[PDB]
Design an enzyme around this catalytic site. Structure first.
Site, PDB file in Angstrom:
ATOM      1  N   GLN A  11       0.799  -1.214   0.000  1.00  0.00           N
ATOM      2  CA  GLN A  11       0.000   0.000   0.000  1.00  0.00           C
ATOM      3  C   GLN A  11       0.829   1.259   0.000  1.00  0.00           C
ATOM      4  O   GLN A  11       0.393   2.277  -0.555  1.00  0.00           O
ATOM      5  CB  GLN A  11      -0.938   0.060   1.182  1.00  0.00           C
ATOM      6  CG  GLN A  11      -0.298   0.319   2.435  1.00  0.00           C
ATOM      7  CD  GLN A  11      -1.242   0.960   3.323  1.00  0.00           C
ATOM      8  OE1 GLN A  11      -2.188   1.570   2.868  1.00  0.00           O
ATOM      9  NE2 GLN A  11      -1.057   0.785   4.608  1.00  0.00           N
ATOM     10  N   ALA A  99      -1.204 -10.043   3.738  1.00  0.00           N
ATOM     11  CA  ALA A  99      -0.207 -10.943   4.264  1.00  0.00           C
ATOM     12  C   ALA A  99       0.085 -10.674   5.713  1.00  0.00           C
ATOM     13  O   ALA A  99       0.632 -11.541   6.388  1.00  0.00           O
ATOM     14  CB  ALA A  99       1.070 -10.853   3.458  1.00  0.00           C
ATOM     15  N   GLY A 143       6.372  -3.603   4.914  1.00  0.00           N
ATOM     16  CA  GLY A 143       5.339  -4.566   5.186  1.00  0.00           C
ATOM     17  C   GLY A 143       5.598  -5.945   4.635  1.00  0.00           C
ATOM     18  O   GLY A 143       6.751  -6.370   4.538  1.00  0.00           O
ATOM     19  N   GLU A 183       9.865  -5.749  11.160  1.00  0.00           N
ATOM     20  CA  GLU A 183      10.457  -5.155   9.971  1.00  0.00           C
ATOM     21  C   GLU A 183      11.820  -5.758   9.717  1.00  0.00           C
ATOM     22  O   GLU A 183      12.092  -6.235   8.606  1.00  0.00           O
ATOM     23  CB  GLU A 183      10.535  -3.653  10.144  1.00  0.00           C
ATOM     24  CG  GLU A 183       9.854  -2.913   9.089  1.00  0.00           C
ATOM     25  CD  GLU A 183       9.822  -1.446   9.375  1.00  0.00           C
ATOM     26  OE1 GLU A 183       9.845  -1.081  10.564  1.00  0.00           O
ATOM     27  OE2 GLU A 183       9.783  -0.653   8.429  1.00  0.00           O
ATOM     28  N   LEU A 252      17.261   5.975 -20.132  1.00  0.00           N
ATOM     29  CA  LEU A 252      17.149   5.014 -19.049  1.00  0.00           C
ATOM     30  C   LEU A 252      18.027   3.784 -19.209  1.00  0.00           C
ATOM     31  O   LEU A 252      17.973   2.875 -18.385  1.00  0.00           O
ATOM     32  CB  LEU A 252      15.695   4.601 -18.928  1.00  0.00           C
ATOM     33  CG  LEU A 252      15.162   4.234 -17.581  1.00  0.00           C
ATOM     34  CD1 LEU A 252      15.683   5.209 -16.639  1.00  0.00           C
ATOM     35  CD2 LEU A 252      13.705   4.398 -17.674  1.00  0.00           C
ATOM     36  N   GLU A 254      21.376   4.677 -20.515  1.00  0.00           N
ATOM     37  CA  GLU A 254      22.652   5.362 -20.370  1.00  0.00           C
ATOM     38  C   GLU A 254      23.056   5.402 -18.911  1.00  0.00           C
ATOM     39  O   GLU A 254      24.174   5.025 -18.539  1.00  0.00           O
ATOM     40  CB  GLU A 254      22.528   6.766 -20.932  1.00  0.00           C
ATOM     41  CG  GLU A 254      22.109   6.780 -22.383  1.00  0.00           C
ATOM     42  CD  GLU A 254      22.472   8.073 -23.072  1.00  0.00           C
ATOM     43  OE1 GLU A 254      22.944   8.027 -24.224  1.00  0.00           O
ATOM     44  OE2 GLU A 254      22.309   9.139 -22.448  1.00  0.00           O
TER      45      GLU A 254
END
Ligand SMILES: [Mg+2]
Lengths: 439, 426, 317, 426, 439
Positions: A11, A99, A143, A183, A252, A254
């Protein structure tokens, strides 16, 4: 002028994204209900926006997103807000359960029921594109969805597609502020993912952004909807050269062979300036030689580690706005001389400038000023090796008493899959230890 | 007759060229639209050195624009003087190049080299007996260096005798803007040295000097650096395109200026150059030109030539001279600096004179030097390489496309030899 | 000392040489095993060569003291085709071919045929498995879903278990086989059938003397563990998954029991895992317990046998 | 989705619930009659977590009211918000229970357990994928303890994975009101510990404190104790039922708060709590909340937490916060009491934020603590047991229904172990 | 809300009952002639009174009594008084002769002719009830009917029905005041009954109630019709929770497993307050913390023994009226601390509160005040073991000269049936001796 797909997991992911897209649809003139008030459609090649959109019929534009979360509760705010009409109502995947900060529960047991519905709305989108650049995988190390489900989505996306550029913006556990007692299991567990199956991993902590909002922006009571906007403009600039004309463009791909001195050492830590208030503006005439100096203060690093104690190994500076390419040279000049900004020897070259022409754009009811210049360093360093070390002294305790192990081994994993992740965040540390010693 | 073809490759090459073909086009009186509105019947007399006829009295140039990212080839087309390239000429792949030399010499260009090698032949057989290929390209990016060098070693196998130019913008440390220059450059130069017969090293540090100090500009956009390298290019070939009192062509310079087979890395320069606030305070006749021309601050190539010795020197003048002015000025500036010109070659200064100025002026001169001072240009590069390679830094992005590790050492040795063999003549 | 672990690396078949799995072990001393530069410290370890009878000579001789009067237990741990069924059940009918369970039952009949006539001893068995967190009997097809309760002195047993006396070897092994025939569903389409559920075998020896009216008892537990199982490499789904989820939460929880005992903390988590509660006496102080883990050195099973060791590495410190 | 079912059993359970379902019902705008008169379209969005649809736009809750004396089930029905339970749901035997645990777990309930176990299944299959059973019940009476624990160990065999709550009001010595609590309680707890994954211990001594001192009431009828335990229950599950900026469900709390398998006896609390004569003399922003929340006199569970250490802690906020307020307040009250939070677990405070307040207020927070202090709650009980049982006092009324004597020792040992294994972490 | 049957034996029984029922029929609105002035009989469940009544037809209510006596003389005052219409004229059994304080004459010889007619009007009443709670057996240890006939009725009621709750309110011989020279034979003889075939035996003496009428009620010339009303309100409160709504109810089975620490030790001794006059009312504002204190004075124990010399083993406090359940807690608090109120250790819990809502009700022409609170302790104790001891020193004399034995052995009994009763009031004494010693 070529296109890149975006995935959002967890989220924090989805809500980083809400602001991402409110900004993108403003940079190009795309109203909330999918339209861009149009012209006589005379053409012969017309790709002004395509990189983050796709045109369909009668004048509607539909974005390229894959919003994914097992929590069924955050997406709904999307599905009924002011961004209702616009997304494609068959992308926003929504599972059954969440989860619950149990990593083992996003890897297999609660996630084996959504990968097959999300790989599909990837592949129906990787083939409405002519040539494809990269995958932006927003997620959150915190999370549980954003640690297991992503380690599944990335592995699938790396053996099916295989050789593409897969970027990664990810929120990291802070050293003091936290909102999850479990965490430091998630984090050490997702390390086997952000080494084998990705290339750029732009970490961004939270206490750091909180500071950057209290000292500079003159807002002391922020919310998540004011951290996400800064993490949004980093992305509107790392992909601001695929999308507008430039006086010195950087694409993107290089980025990477400029920015990654080895196969593994690829964790840069971003930055951004000007971040000035509404009334602390006029007392600044912030010209280039200044905003290139704000970037190296060890008090605007969006990841709370001290860059002074360390050594840069590359940089990258994607200026934008009204910047002509001599001032940048005097600027990089000044920076190249200083003490206490120690570039490592084996990279005497130093930098990689890159400029664009579009002013960074404002979001109504926001909290940033209409500046006419900007910059987003992306400076690989060795200092970051002192954030991960922190999470180690938050795991070699919560694991010595096998605390909280039960919720994890309960959903399939084993006691070993912890010591694996241990050694594999130990090697990364040994390697930034190494590549910094001078030869 | 004496026709020249033109190959551009890279964002540089193209933004140089879109200015080149504006100076050239306005020498010969060519509108943007291909039509013609000259005034003197002398302009349209060798028009076919850089042009081709096309029905209805349109003139279309002989460009071969090349690059691997399909944005440049659009920027060109919308600029002024864009209607003019005839559209088959562009050749654009669509996957960028990524400042990786490998991807221009083995993989993502090797599948574009033919759709250009197959427009040179379309544009090498509408000409009676051509003379050479120009090739204007930045030696730092990814298309330019690798793709361009590949293009050049393919061109030098279907035409092993015609002459070969290159206008290569070189890395400089004080205005560096990429992190793998010292691989791009030292890989490109191991193959320019074996496969061209003249190479004008422009570089951006010095080209910035020349607009801070001399031309005294507040702000040099790139549009006023390319507008000097354009005039050097327009110079080096002005006898092919106008009547002169001592004519010199690419073959002339390329025989008078190269004193051995390898040492062909020239440095150009141009004069007058006046901040046109300062213009009324200086009236130039020949000697003012020839004294500005040998200044340390009009060598568009970054080096101080005083720490070296001019092996040979050329001077292609334009305007109505009085030729003893030229001859005696050259003897003067050859006897004032007896220590800066090598001994065992006498009368080092080749001269030439055209007869039409660049429009708006009355006198101009394009210096082409060949100094041993370049001893330092390739020398600093080697440092910024022999540290990086010594830790295989940034190396993987090259092994990933096919190159070997060994090939780097090959390049290194073969750009250390060169410095050794300017150094004998010091 | 209290607890002892044992590792045994079987030799290699012909399917491995056909595929040519490399030999991956490395030893040193008689304590250190090493695989891929990671050191594992143990107590007692065995090569491709050591013979069966020294296994139990160093593993279960000090069973002698179960019969002499205290408690004891032995675990066995093993993934597929790692020698488990070769080191316990064994060649039943060679004197130098049997496994570990008969290398016990024989010592017990010896002790009972060689002791004085003033003494009398009783031999008793029980055979129950654990599956999906219910203690099933085997000797009784219909007595399922047992519970457990203690006595006044705080030592547990199972309330209802079928107990059959035993006096002769054939009696023992007959019970063993009839019980084996009814573990819950085990075999697959491939060959990953690795005993999906735990099994426990209690051998009770009680003694009484008439010279002194002194009566002693010893309980001897034989534990056959199930195999740990990941949930990526297997790919399971649906019903079988519920087995996986469960097996682990036992072993991992079991870990704690074997930890703090060997460590030496103040109090030990015995309740959280139905099996450790059935043993509770048989692991603790003044009780002898030993684990018997089995590990393959081949490569096609590599990422398995690593784990097969870490578990044991727990039980030391 | 994410649906929760609800089991009440005992005079407590029912009089708690008849208030519960009045706070819940007025969060979502539900009249008594089942009809709907909300105002914001946000209320009716997860209405189906505690409700079911029924034709004609009536909403009927998911209650399973249970007890063994047919008076309670009538008292409920006449109160306000009584028309609403749909009448099949009640299940009442007719012979009271008699403060005898035996008669709730073996004899007079074993013949009522099925007519409820057979309404859970009727009410467990009109839901997509449910999440857990609540069970609000007094641990002292006869129905509640024995009947309820039996109901729970039957529910945990047809659903061995879904989550399991309990809101158990616990004995307290200073307001004791029966003579065989120390058999009821210690027999109930030997079976809550093996068969639930979270248990909020309310108890009546402390709940009386909180209305003498803080809320400063002359007279606390029971209607103003149940009206606080109702708000804690309404809190612990407010993310399932509203949009939030950091969502937390029963699974969230039940994974972040339980640091081993057994230690799951939490203690709740609520803040603000102001005698609404005193309300204008205090304006709360976040810090006032988080300082009242950790007071020794807002632990609805009777114990002083200072003689213990919070192992883990949770805080489910409701209202519009500014999340660094939350984060830095929590770091503050984690660094001010470094001796009250256990070391070998860092960042003990789990947080969450909803977005609608409880109606009438602007900010509220439901604390859920897990302290080792409960070392004392189960400890005093054991005294009031290990004297009574040591003389078989009051014992016969238990042997008369089937229990054994041994079973008491089983319970005793199994509630002394528990105290031992909070005591290690002290 | 469930029902209980009542038996009355002996004439003290019948006259305790006369007042019992005049009070019950007032607590519910039941006039003397069986009616309750009624309503539109809309219903769906209507059991406001049922516990002591049964509805029959057209609006009449009939009580559940079994009045039994062999004396044919006391019942007639019923059969023609103001309570004529109301009882059911086939319940009031009336024999031929009376036992004349000869126990042996109520057991078999004059009572074998009435049990079969009284068991019948029990069983026709134990089956007009849906579920049955208990049997209230009023009788009088004094005379002869209430000692033999009851020991017959209770044994029959305990082997036919067997397992019900059988309560027992019984008048005991006083230590000084008496009205029968042969009382201490009856008493010791009915002990084999109030151990094997009953559970609660609420004894109530007489001199005690006489005091409680002279000191508190300001009446010095009482009669039996003023002791019976107090023994009536004890019963309107031990059964006041089966019959009205409560804030904390206690049911006629809860009572026992709260109140009986063992199988045999089950003789509580009741109490009641407020008992105040008509003019000594207004000088009292008798709130809960006071009326819970009147109960423990050793001068309101309705059984003249000293509770100070003893130890409580349980209590039970059935408050009623306007009592909210915090005040009770402060009250029990105060009581729990005192010296000289010695609770035994092995019952540290202590109490069992219970509250109702109906004010205790007044009986016109009575002698109690309209109080708004009340309470009836029922406190098991050890002190009562010092009343029975008295009757022993009144029997180990009248039996040493076999005095009066002839009237007894004359009707069947034997000389042994006396020494049996001796040892069996000796064991009871030994056992309250025991359960009071501290362990
Ligand atoms: Mg009850």
């Amino acid at each position: 002028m070529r296109e890149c797909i975006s995935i959002h997991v967890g989220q924090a992911g989805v809500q980083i994204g809400n602001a991402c897209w409110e900004l993108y649809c403003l940079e190009h003139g795309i109203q909330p209900d999918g339209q861009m008030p149009s012209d006589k459609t005379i053409g012969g090649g017309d790709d002004s926006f395509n990189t983050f959109f796709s045109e369909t019929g009668a004048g509607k534009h539909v974005p390229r997103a894959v919003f994914v979360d097992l929590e069924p509760t955050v997406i709904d705010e999307v599905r009924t807000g002011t961004y209702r009409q616009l997304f494609h109502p068959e992308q926003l995947i929504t599972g059954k359960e969440d989860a619950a900060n149990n990593y083992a529960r996003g890897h297999y047991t609660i996630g084996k029921e959504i990968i097959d519905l999300v790989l599909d709305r990837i592949r129906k989108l990787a083939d409405q594109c002519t040539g494809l650049q990269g995958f932006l995988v927003f997620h959150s190390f915190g999370g549980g969805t954003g640690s297991g489900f992503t380690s599944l989505l990335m592995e699938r996306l790396s053996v099916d597609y295989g050789k593409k550029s897969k970027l990664e913006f990810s929120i990291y556990p802070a050293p003091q502020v936290s909102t999850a007692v479990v965490e430091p299991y998630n984090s050490i567990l997702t390390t086997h993912t952000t080494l084998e199956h990705s290339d750029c991993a732009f970490m961004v902590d939270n206490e750091a952004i909180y500071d950057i909002c209290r000292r500079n922006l003159d807002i002391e009571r922020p919310t998540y909807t004011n951290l996400n906007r800064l993490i949004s403009q980093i992305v509107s600039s790392i992909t601001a050269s695929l999308r507008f004309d430039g006086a010195l463009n950087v694409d993107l791909t290089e980025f990477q062979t400029n920015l990654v001195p080895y196969p593994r050492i690829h964790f840069p830590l971003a930055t951004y300036a000007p971040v000035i208030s509404a009334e602390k503006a006029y007392h600044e005439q912030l010209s280039v030689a200044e905003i290139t100096n704000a970037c190296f203060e060890p008090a605007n690093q969006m990841v709370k580690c001290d860059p002074r104690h360390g050594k840069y190994m590359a940089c990258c500076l994607l200026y934008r706005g009204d910047v002509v390419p001599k001032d940048v040279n005097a600027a990089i000049a000044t920076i190249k001389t200083k003490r206490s900004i120690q570039f490592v020897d084996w990279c005497p070259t130093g930098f990689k400038v890159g400029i664009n022409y579009q002013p960074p754009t404002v979001v109504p009811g926001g909290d940033l000023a209409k500046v006419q210049r900007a910059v987003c360093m992306l400076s690989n360093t060795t200092a970051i090796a002192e954030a991960w070390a922190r999470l180690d002294h938050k795991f070699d305790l919560m694991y010595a008493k096998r605390a909280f192990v039960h919720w994890y081994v309960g959903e399939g994993m084993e006691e070993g899959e912890f010591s694996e992740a241990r050694e594999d965040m130990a090697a990364l540390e040994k390697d930034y230890e190494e590549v910094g010693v001078d030869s | 007759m004496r026709e020249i073809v033109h190959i551009q490759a890279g964002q540089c090459g193209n933004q140089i060229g879109a200015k080149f073909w504006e100076v050239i086009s306005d020498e010969h009186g060519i509108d943007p639209t291909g039509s013609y509105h000259g005034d003197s019947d002398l302009q349209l007399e060798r028009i076919n050195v850089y042009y081709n006829e096309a029905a209805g009295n349109k003139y279309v140039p002989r460009a071969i624009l090349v690059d691997l990212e399909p944005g440049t080839m659009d920027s060109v087309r919308s600029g002024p003087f864009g209607q003019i390239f005839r559209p088959d000429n562009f050749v654009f792949g669509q996957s960028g190049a990524g400042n990786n030399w490998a991807k221009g010499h083995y993989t993502e260009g090797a599948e574009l080299v033919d759709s250009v090698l197959d427009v040179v032949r379309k544009e090498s057989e509408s000409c009676d007996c051509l003379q050479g290929f120009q090739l204007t390209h930045s030696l730092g990016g990814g298309t330019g260096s690798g793709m361009g060098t590949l293009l050049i070693s393919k061109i030098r196998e279907e035409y092993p005798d015609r002459i070969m130019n290159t206008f290569s913008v070189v890395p400089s440390p004080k205005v560096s803007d990429t992190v793998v220059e010292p691989y791009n450059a030292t890989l490109s130069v191991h193959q320019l040295v074996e496969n061209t017969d003249e190479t004008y090293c422009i570089d951006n540090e010095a080209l910035y000097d020349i607009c801070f100090r001399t031309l005294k500009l507040t702000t040099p956009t790139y549009g006023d650096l390319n507008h000097l390298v354009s005039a050097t290019m327009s110079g080096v070939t002005t006898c092919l395109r106008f009547p002169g009192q001592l004519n010199a062509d690419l073959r002339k310079l390329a025989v008078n200026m190269v004193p051995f087979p390898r040492l062909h890395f020239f440095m150009p320069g141009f004069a007058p150059l006046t901040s046109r606030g300062s213009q009324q305070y200086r009236a130039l006749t020949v000697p003012e030109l020839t004294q500005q021309m040998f200044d340390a601050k009009n060598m568009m190539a970054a080096c101080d030539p005083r720490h070296g010795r001019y092996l040979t020197v050329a001077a292609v003048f334009r305007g109505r001279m009085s030729m003893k002015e030229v001859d005696e000025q050259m003897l003067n500036v050859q006897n004032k600096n007896s220590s800066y010109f090598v001994e065992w070659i006498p009368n080092n200064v080749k001269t030439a004179v055209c007869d039409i100025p660049p429009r708006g002026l009355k006198m101009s001169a394009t210096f082409i030097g060949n100094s041993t001072a370049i001893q330092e240009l390739f020398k600093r590069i080697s440092e910024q390489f022999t540290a990086m390679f010594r830790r295989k830094a940034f190396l993987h992005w090259y092994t990933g496309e096919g190159m070997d590790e060994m090939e780097f050492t090959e390049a290194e040795s073969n750009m250390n030899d060169l410095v050794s063999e300017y150094q004998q003549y010091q | 000392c209290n607890i002892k672990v044992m590792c045994r690396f079987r030799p290699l078949n012909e399917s491995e040489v056909n595929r040519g799995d490399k030999y991956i072990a490395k030893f040193q001393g008689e304590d250190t095993v090493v695989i891929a530069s990671k050191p594992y410290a143990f107590d007692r370890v065995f090569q491709s060569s050591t013979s069966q009878e020294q296994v139990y000579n160093d593993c279960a001789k000090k069973v002698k003291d179960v019969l002499e009067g205290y408690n004891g237990t032995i675990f066995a741990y093993g993934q597929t085709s790692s020698g488990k069924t070769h080191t316990m059940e064994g060649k039943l009918h060679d004197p130098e071919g049997m496994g570990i369970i008969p290398r016990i039952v024989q010592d017990i009949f010896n002790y009972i045929y060689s002791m004085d006539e003033n003494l009398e001893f009783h031999i008793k068995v029980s055979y129950f498995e654990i599956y999906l967190d219910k203690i099933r009997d085997l000797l009784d097809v219909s007595k399922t879903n047992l519970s457990v309760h203690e006595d006044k002195n705080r030592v547990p047993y199972v309330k209802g278990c079928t107990e059959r006396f035993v006096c002769s070897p054939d009696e023992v092994m007959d019970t063993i086989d009839e019980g084996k025939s009814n573990r819950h569903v085990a075999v697959t389409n491939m060959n990953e059938h690795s005993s999906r559920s735990h099994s426990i075998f209690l051998i009770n020896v009680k003694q009484e003397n008439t010279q002194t009216e002194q009566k002693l008892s010893g309980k001897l537990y034989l534990v056959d563990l199930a195999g740990s199982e990941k949930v990526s490499k297997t790919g399971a789904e649906g019903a079988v998954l519920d087995e996986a989820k469960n097996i682990n939460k036992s072993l991992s929880a079991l870990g704690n029991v074997i930890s703090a005992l060997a460590e030496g903390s103040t109090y030990v988590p015995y309740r959280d895992s139905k099996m450790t509660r059935i043993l509770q006496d048989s692991l603790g102080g003044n009780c002898r317990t030993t684990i018997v883990i089995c590990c393959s050195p081949s490569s096609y099973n590599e990422s398995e046998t690593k784990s097969t060791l870490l578990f044991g590495q727990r039980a030391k410190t």
